[PDB]
Amino acid sequence: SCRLLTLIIILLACIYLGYYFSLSSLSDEFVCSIKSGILRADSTVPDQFQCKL
Amino acid sequence: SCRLLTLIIILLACIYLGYYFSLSSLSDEFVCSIKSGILRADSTVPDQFQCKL
Ligand SMILES: CC(C)CCC[C@@H](C)[C@H]1CC[C@H]2[C@@H]3CC=C4C[C@@H](O)CC[C@]4(C)[C@H]3CC[C@]12C
Ligand SMILES: CC(C)CCC[C@@H](C)[C@H]1CC[C@H]2[C@@H]3CC=C4C[C@@H](O)CC[C@]4(C)[C@H]3CC[C@]12C
Ligand SMILES: CC(C)CCC[C@@H](C)[C@H]1CC[C@H]2[C@@H]3CC=C4C[C@@H](O)CC[C@]4(C)[C@H]3CC[C@]12C
Ligand SMILES: CC(C)CCC[C@@H](C)[C@H]1CC[C@H]2[C@@H]3CC=C4C[C@@H](O)CC[C@]4(C)[C@H]3CC[C@]12C
């Protein structure tokens, strides 16, 4: 039972890592917008920012 | 008739000038707001300006 759980967890980890490595490699670039709350009416703040992880 | 019209116009002018001289002398200070049109959404513009004639 311990061996089977180790195998199951290793297979789940393999699935997750294979999925993660398959990500677009441009998925680390996302557009972000600080315009909630009182900054919504703020015009000195651009509509959106180019962030990169 | 010309003399009477001159007298009438002079009296009307006296009334107007007496009114004008009686103005508050602070009536030359007025608050003005450039917030029509697309500047309404503009936050870099204060709500109102202190103008003086
Ligand atoms: C233990 C061994 C079999 C692991 C091998 C890696 C496997 C699990 C990886 C490698 C490539 C991966 C796939 C790559 C792309 C996609 C498309 C996506 O829209 C859904 C997930 C899916 C379908 C992934 C599922 C997991 C996957 C099949
Ligand atoms: C540790 C275990 C739970 C890992 C299991 C794999 C995880 C990491 C991944 C592999 C493929 C992934 C799925 C791929 C595609 C989609 C379709 C999308 O519209 C909603 C998310 C969903 C349904 C993903 C959910 C998470 C997912 C199941
Ligand atoms: C030819 C002679 C009689 C001219 C004398 C000046 C007269 C016409 C001026 C001097 C003071 C003036 C008044 C000063 C203040 C006010 C109050 C305002 O709420 C209405 C106008 C009114 C009532 C003005 C009317 C004109 C007025 C009476
Ligand atoms: C050349 C002629 C027409 C000059 C006549 C006098 C003019 C300059 C002035 C003298 C007093 C003034 C009035 C004084 C007070 C008021 C009340 C206000 O709620 C509306 C304007 C009104 C009704 C003004 C209209 C203009 C007026 C009549």
Coordinates of N, CA and C and ligand atoms in Angstrom, one line a residue:
Chain A
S1 N 0.8 -1.2 0.0 CA 0.0 0.0 0.0 C 0.9 1.3 0.0
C2 N 1.9 1.3 0.8 CA 2.8 2.4 0.7 C 3.5 2.5 -0.6
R3 N 3.9 1.4 -1.2 CA 4.5 1.4 -2.5 C 3.5 1.9 -3.6
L4 N 2.3 1.5 -3.5 CA 1.3 1.9 -4.5 C 1.0 3.3 -4.3
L5 N 0.9 3.9 -3.1 CA 0.7 5.3 -3.0 C 1.8 6.1 -3.5
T6 N 3.1 5.6 -3.3 CA 4.2 6.3 -3.8 C 4.1 6.3 -5.4
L7 N 3.8 5.2 -6.0 CA 3.6 5.2 -7.4 C 2.5 6.1 -7.9
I8 N 1.4 6.1 -7.2 CA 0.3 7.0 -7.6 C 0.7 8.4 -7.6
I9 N 1.4 8.8 -6.5 CA 1.7 10.2 -6.3 C 2.8 10.6 -7.3
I10 N 3.7 9.7 -7.6 CA 4.7 10.0 -8.6 C 4.1 10.1 -10.0
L11 N 3.1 9.3 -10.3 CA 2.5 9.4 -11.6 C 1.7 10.7 -11.7
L12 N 1.0 11.1 -10.6 CA 0.3 12.4 -10.6 C 1.3 13.5 -10.8
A13 N 2.4 13.5 -10.1 CA 3.4 14.5 -10.2 C 4.0 14.6 -11.6
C14 N 4.2 13.4 -12.3 CA 4.6 13.4 -13.6 C 3.6 14.1 -14.5
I15 N 2.3 13.8 -14.3 CA 1.3 14.4 -15.2 C 1.3 15.9 -15.0
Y16 N 1.4 16.3 -13.7 CA 1.4 17.8 -13.5 C 2.6 18.5 -14.1
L17 N 3.8 17.9 -13.9 CA 5.0 18.5 -14.5 C 5.0 18.5 -16.0
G18 N 4.5 17.4 -16.6 CA 4.4 17.4 -18.0 C 3.5 18.5 -18.5
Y19 N 2.4 18.7 -17.8 CA 1.5 19.8 -18.2 C 2.2 21.1 -18.0
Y20 N 2.9 21.3 -16.9 CA 3.5 22.6 -16.6 C 4.5 22.9 -17.6
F21 N 5.4 22.0 -17.9 CA 6.4 22.2 -18.9 C 5.9 22.5 -20.3
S22 N 4.6 22.0 -20.6 CA 4.0 22.2 -21.9 C 3.3 23.6 -22.0
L23 N 3.4 24.4 -20.9 CA 2.8 25.8 -21.0 C 3.5 26.6 -22.1
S24 N 2.8 27.7 -22.5 CA 3.1 28.4 -23.7 C 4.5 29.1 -23.7
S25 N 5.1 29.2 -22.5 CA 6.4 29.9 -22.4 C 6.2 31.4 -22.6
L26 N 5.1 31.8 -23.1 CA 4.7 33.2 -23.1 C 3.6 33.5 -22.1
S27 N 3.2 32.5 -21.4 CA 2.1 32.6 -20.4 C 2.6 33.4 -19.2
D28 N 3.9 33.7 -19.1 CA 4.5 34.5 -18.0 C 4.2 36.0 -18.3
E29 N 3.8 36.4 -19.5 CA 3.4 37.7 -19.8 C 1.9 37.9 -19.6
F30 N 1.5 38.7 -18.7 CA 0.1 39.0 -18.6 C -0.1 40.5 -18.4
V31 N -1.3 41.0 -18.8 CA -1.6 42.4 -18.8 C -2.4 42.6 -17.5
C32 N -2.0 43.6 -16.7 CA -2.6 43.8 -15.4 C -3.1 45.3 -15.3
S33 N -4.2 45.5 -14.6 CA -4.8 46.8 -14.5 C -5.1 47.2 -13.1
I34 N -4.5 48.2 -12.6 CA -4.8 48.7 -11.2 C -5.8 49.8 -11.3
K35 N -7.1 49.4 -11.5 CA -8.1 50.3 -11.7 C -9.4 49.9 -10.9
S36 N -9.2 49.3 -9.7 CA -10.3 49.1 -8.8 C -10.4 50.2 -7.8
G37 N -11.5 50.4 -7.2 CA -11.7 51.4 -6.2 C -11.5 52.8 -6.7
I38 N -11.0 53.7 -5.9 CA -10.9 55.1 -6.3 C -9.9 55.3 -7.4
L39 N -9.1 54.4 -7.8 CA -8.2 54.6 -8.9 C -9.0 54.4 -10.2
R40 N -10.2 54.0 -10.2 CA -11.0 53.8 -11.4 C -11.2 55.2 -12.1
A41 N -11.4 56.2 -11.3 CA -11.6 57.6 -11.8 C -10.3 58.3 -12.1
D42 N -9.2 57.7 -11.6 CA -7.8 58.3 -11.8 C -7.3 58.2 -13.2
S43 N -7.1 59.3 -13.9 CA -6.7 59.4 -15.3 C -5.2 59.4 -15.5
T44 N -4.4 59.5 -14.4 CA -2.9 59.5 -14.5 C -2.4 58.1 -14.6
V45 N -3.3 57.1 -14.3 CA -3.0 55.7 -14.3 C -3.4 55.1 -15.7
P46 N -2.5 54.5 -16.4 CA -2.9 53.9 -17.7 C -3.9 52.8 -17.5
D47 N -4.5 52.4 -18.5 CA -5.6 51.4 -18.4 C -5.0 50.0 -18.0
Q48 N -3.8 49.7 -18.5 CA -3.3 48.4 -18.2 C -1.8 48.4 -18.3
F49 N -1.1 47.5 -17.6 CA 0.3 47.4 -17.5 C 0.8 46.1 -18.1
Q50 N 2.0 46.0 -18.6 CA 2.6 44.8 -19.2 C 3.5 44.2 -18.1
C51 N 3.0 43.2 -17.4 CA 3.8 42.5 -16.4 C 4.4 41.2 -16.9
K52 N 5.5 40.8 -16.4 CA 6.1 39.6 -16.8 C 6.6 38.8 -15.5
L53 N 6.3 37.6 -15.4 CA 6.7 36.7 -14.3 C 8.1 36.2 -14.6
Chain B
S1 N -37.6 117.5 -29.3 CA -37.5 116.1 -29.3 C -36.1 115.6 -29.2
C2 N -35.2 116.2 -29.9 CA -33.8 115.8 -29.8 C -33.3 116.1 -28.3
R3 N -33.7 117.3 -27.8 CA -33.3 117.6 -26.4 C -33.9 116.6 -25.4
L4 N -35.1 116.2 -25.6 CA -35.7 115.2 -24.7 C -35.1 113.9 -24.8
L5 N -34.8 113.4 -26.0 CA -34.1 112.1 -26.1 C -32.7 112.2 -25.5
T6 N -32.0 113.3 -25.6 CA -30.7 113.4 -25.0 C -30.9 113.3 -23.5
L7 N -31.9 114.0 -22.9 CA -32.1 114.0 -21.5 C -32.5 112.5 -21.0
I8 N -33.3 111.9 -21.8 CA -33.7 110.5 -21.5 C -32.5 109.6 -21.5
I9 N -31.7 109.7 -22.5 CA -30.5 108.8 -22.6 C -29.5 109.1 -21.5
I10 N -29.4 110.4 -21.1 CA -28.5 110.7 -20.1 C -29.0 110.2 -18.7
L11 N -30.3 110.3 -18.5 CA -30.8 109.7 -17.3 C -30.7 108.2 -17.2
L12 N -30.9 107.5 -18.3 CA -30.7 106.1 -18.3 C -29.3 105.7 -18.1
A13 N -28.3 106.5 -18.7 CA -26.9 106.3 -18.4 C -26.6 106.5 -17.0
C14 N -27.1 107.6 -16.4 CA -26.9 107.8 -15.0 C -27.4 106.7 -14.1
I15 N -28.6 106.1 -14.4 CA -29.1 105.0 -13.7 C -28.1 103.8 -13.8
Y16 N -27.7 103.5 -15.0 CA -26.8 102.4 -15.2 C -25.5 102.6 -14.5
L17 N -24.9 103.7 -14.6 CA -23.6 104.0 -14.0 C -23.7 103.9 -12.5
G18 N -24.8 104.5 -11.9 CA -25.0 104.4 -10.5 C -25.2 103.0 -10.0
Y19 N -25.8 102.1 -10.8 CA -25.9 100.7 -10.5 C -24.6 100.1 -10.5
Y20 N -23.8 100.4 -11.6 CA -22.5 99.7 -11.8 C -21.5 100.1 -10.7
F21 N -21.5 101.3 -10.4 CA -20.6 101.7 -9.3 C -21.0 101.1 -8.0
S22 N -22.2 100.8 -7.8 CA -22.7 100.2 -6.6 C -22.4 98.7 -6.5
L23 N -21.8 98.1 -7.5 CA -21.5 96.7 -7.4 C -20.5 96.4 -6.2
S24 N -20.5 95.1 -5.9 CA -19.9 94.8 -4.6 C -18.4 95.0 -4.5
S25 N -17.7 95.2 -5.6 CA -16.3 95.4 -5.7 C -15.5 94.2 -5.4
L26 N -16.2 93.1 -4.9 CA -15.7 91.8 -4.9 C -16.3 90.9 -6.0
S27 N -17.2 91.5 -6.8 CA -17.9 90.8 -7.9 C -16.9 90.5 -9.0
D28 N -15.7 91.1 -9.0 CA -14.7 90.7 -10.0 C -14.0 89.4 -9.7
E29 N -14.3 88.8 -8.5 CA -13.7 87.5 -8.2 C -14.8 86.5 -8.5
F30 N -14.6 85.5 -9.4 CA -15.5 84.5 -9.6 C -14.8 83.2 -9.7
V31 N -15.5 82.1 -9.4 CA -14.9 80.7 -9.5 C -15.3 80.1 -10.8
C32 N -14.4 79.6 -11.5 CA -14.6 79.1 -12.9 C -14.1 77.6 -12.9
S33 N -14.8 76.8 -13.7 CA -14.5 75.4 -13.8 C -14.4 74.9 -15.3
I34 N -13.2 74.5 -15.7 CA -13.1 74.0 -17.0 C -13.3 72.5 -16.9
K35 N -14.5 72.1 -16.9 CA -14.8 70.6 -16.8 C -16.0 70.2 -17.7
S36 N -16.1 70.8 -18.8 CA -17.1 70.4 -19.8 C -16.4 69.5 -20.8
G37 N -17.2 68.7 -21.5 CA -16.6 67.8 -22.5 C -15.7 66.7 -21.9
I38 N -14.7 66.4 -22.6 CA -13.8 65.3 -22.2 C -12.9 65.6 -21.0
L39 N -12.9 66.9 -20.6 CA -12.2 67.2 -19.4 C -12.9 66.9 -18.1
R40 N -14.2 66.5 -18.3 CA -15.0 66.1 -17.1 C -14.4 64.9 -16.4
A41 N -13.9 64.0 -17.2 CA -13.3 62.7 -16.7 C -11.8 63.0 -16.3
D42 N -11.2 64.1 -16.7 CA -9.8 64.5 -16.4 C -9.6 64.8 -14.9
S43 N -8.8 64.0 -14.2 CA -8.5 64.2 -12.8 C -7.3 65.1 -12.5
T44 N -6.5 65.5 -13.5 CA -5.4 66.3 -13.3 C -5.8 67.8 -13.2
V45 N -7.1 68.1 -13.6 CA -7.7 69.4 -13.6 C -8.5 69.5 -12.3
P46 N -8.2 70.6 -11.5 CA -8.9 70.8 -10.3 C -10.4 71.1 -10.6
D47 N -11.2 71.0 -9.6 CA -12.7 71.2 -9.8 C -13.0 72.6 -10.2
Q48 N -12.3 73.6 -9.7 CA -12.6 75.0 -10.0 C -11.4 75.9 -9.7
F49 N -11.4 77.0 -10.4 CA -10.3 77.9 -10.4 C -10.8 79.3 -9.9
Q50 N -9.9 80.0 -9.2 CA -10.2 81.3 -8.7 C -9.7 82.3 -9.7
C51 N -10.6 82.9 -10.5 CA -10.3 83.9 -11.4 C -10.7 85.3 -10.9
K52 N -10.0 86.3 -11.4 CA -10.3 87.7 -11.0 C -10.2 88.6 -12.2
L53 N -11.3 89.4 -12.4 CA -11.3 90.4 -13.5 C -10.6 91.6 -13.0
Ligands
LIG1 C1 4.2 9.3 -16.7 C2 4.2 9.8 -18.2 C3 3.2 9.1 -19.0 C4 4.0 11.3 -18.2 C5 4.1 12.0 -19.6 C6 3.7 13.4 -19.7 C7 2.2 13.6 -20.0 C8 1.3 13.3 -18.7 C9 2.0 15.1 -20.5 C10 2.9 15.5 -21.6 C11 2.2 16.4 -22.6 C12 0.9 16.8 -21.8 C13 -0.2 17.4 -22.5 C14 0.2 18.7 -23.2 C15 -1.0 19.5 -23.7 C16 -2.2 19.3 -23.3 C17 -3.3 20.2 -23.8 C18 -4.2 20.8 -22.8 O1 -5.3 21.5 -23.4 C19 -4.7 19.8 -21.8 C20 -3.5 19.0 -21.2 C21 -2.6 18.3 -22.2 C22 -3.4 17.2 -23.0 C23 -1.4 17.8 -21.5 C24 -1.7 16.6 -20.6 C25 -0.4 16.0 -19.9 C26 0.6 15.5 -21.0 C27 0.0 14.4 -21.9
LIG2 C1 -1.7 16.6 -8.7 C2 -2.8 16.3 -9.7 C3 -4.1 16.7 -9.2 C4 -2.5 17.0 -11.1 C5 -3.4 16.7 -12.2 C6 -3.2 17.5 -13.4 C7 -3.4 19.0 -13.4 C8 -2.2 19.7 -12.9 C9 -3.9 19.5 -14.7 C10 -3.5 18.6 -15.9 C11 -4.4 19.1 -17.1 C12 -5.3 20.2 -16.5 C13 -6.6 20.6 -17.2 C14 -6.3 21.0 -18.6 C15 -7.5 21.8 -19.2 C16 -8.5 22.3 -18.5 C17 -9.7 22.9 -19.2 C18 -10.0 24.3 -18.6 O1 -11.1 24.9 -19.3 C19 -10.2 24.2 -17.1 C20 -9.0 23.6 -16.4 C21 -8.6 22.2 -17.0 C22 -9.7 21.1 -16.7 C23 -7.2 21.8 -16.4 C24 -7.3 21.5 -14.9 C25 -6.0 21.1 -14.3 C26 -5.4 19.8 -15.0 C27 -6.3 18.6 -14.8
LIG3 C1 -29.9 110.8 -12.0 C2 -29.7 110.3 -10.6 C3 -31.0 110.3 -9.9 C4 -29.0 109.0 -10.5 C5 -28.6 108.6 -9.1 C6 -28.1 107.1 -9.0 C7 -29.2 106.0 -8.8 C8 -30.0 105.8 -10.1 C9 -28.5 104.8 -8.3 C10 -27.6 105.0 -7.1 C11 -27.8 103.8 -6.2 C12 -28.4 102.7 -7.0 C13 -29.0 101.5 -6.4 C14 -28.0 100.8 -5.6 C15 -28.4 99.4 -5.2 C16 -29.5 98.8 -5.7 C17 -30.0 97.4 -5.2 C18 -30.2 96.4 -6.3 O1 -30.7 95.2 -5.8 C19 -31.1 97.0 -7.3 C20 -30.6 98.3 -7.9 C21 -30.4 99.4 -6.8 C22 -31.7 99.8 -6.2 C23 -29.7 100.6 -7.4 C24 -30.5 101.4 -8.4 C25 -29.9 102.6 -9.0 C26 -29.4 103.6 -7.9 C27 -30.6 104.1 -7.1
LIG4 C1 -29.6 101.5 -20.3 C2 -30.8 101.1 -19.3 C3 -31.5 100.0 -19.9 C4 -30.2 100.8 -18.0 C5 -31.2 100.4 -16.9 C6 -30.6 99.9 -15.6 C7 -29.9 98.5 -15.7 C8 -28.5 98.7 -16.1 C9 -30.1 97.8 -14.3 C10 -30.4 98.7 -13.1 C11 -31.0 97.8 -12.0 C12 -30.9 96.4 -12.6 C13 -31.8 95.3 -12.0 C14 -31.4 95.0 -10.6 C15 -31.9 93.7 -10.1 C16 -32.4 92.8 -10.8 C17 -33.0 91.5 -10.2 C18 -32.4 90.2 -10.7 O1 -33.0 89.1 -10.2 C19 -32.5 90.2 -12.2 C20 -31.9 91.5 -12.9 C21 -32.5 92.8 -12.3 C22 -33.9 93.0 -12.8 C23 -31.6 94.0 -12.8 C24 -31.7 94.2 -14.4 C25 -30.8 95.3 -14.9 C26 -31.1 96.6 -14.2 C27 -32.5 97.1 -14.5

